[PDB]
Ligand binder design. Structure first.
Ligand SMILES: O=C(Nc1ccc(C(=O)N[C@@H]2c3cccc(O)c3C[C@@H]2C(=O)O)cc1)NC1CC1
Length: 167
């Protein structure tokens, strides 16, 4: 039993809720919150900009030190950093950005990072300003992630479309 409340169960291991991932992170304090990162960990907008704002820019400061030491991530890759005031850890995962021409097949590789964590609060990878179809992203999530994932979908209309179209 965990403290995530009000989720609809999609499969054995995937749950979904119309929620602001920032507010959900502040209330649950999960072990892992997933960020929709880019390879430079420049948290300007979308989920990343919101999570970073909620940390008063501490996420960005930590991220800049990480990049200065290690260089950029790979598209499809990830790193574990602090969750600051939102979670124990933040798993920064880089899904492909369609608005940069990146290969959508890398979306499965991106979701594979979730399997290294038993439970996660996460957004749909490559959705929103990353330009992928969120229905496709949800399908890849369900078919790739085997650990327990709680998906927060900010947009109520997108949320009900995701639920109503889910196979
Ligand atoms: O600002 C915040 N939270 C905040 C939370 C999420 C986002 C964001 O970009 N969401 C994206 C979106 C939007 C529309 C359609 C989509 O497919 C997606 C994918 C992605 C998602 O929903 O996961 C932005 C901001 N909180 C403080 C109090 C105001």
């Amino acid at each position: 039993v965990n403290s995530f409340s009000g989720y609809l169960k999609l499969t054995d291991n995937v749950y979904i809720k119309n929620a602001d991932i920032v507010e959900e992170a502040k209330k649950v304090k999960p072990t892992v919150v997933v960020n929709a990162a880019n390879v430079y960990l420049k948290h300007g907008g979308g989920v990343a900009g919101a999570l970073n704002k909620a940390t008063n820019n501490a996420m960005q400061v930590e991220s800049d030190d990480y990049i200065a030491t290690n260089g950029p991530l790979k598209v499809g890759g990830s790193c574990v950093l602090s969750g600051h005031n939102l979670a124990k850890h933040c798993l920064h995962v880089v899904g492909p950005n369609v608005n940069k021409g990146e290969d959508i097949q890398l979306l499965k590789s991106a979701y594979e990072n979730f399997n290294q964590h038993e439970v996660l609060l996460a957004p749909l990878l490559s959705a929103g300003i990353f330009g992928a179809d969120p229905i496709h992203s949800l399908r890849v999530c369900v078919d790739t992630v085997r650990t327990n994932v709680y998906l927060a979908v900010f947009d109520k209309n997108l949320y009900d479309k995701l639920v109503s179209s889910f196979l």
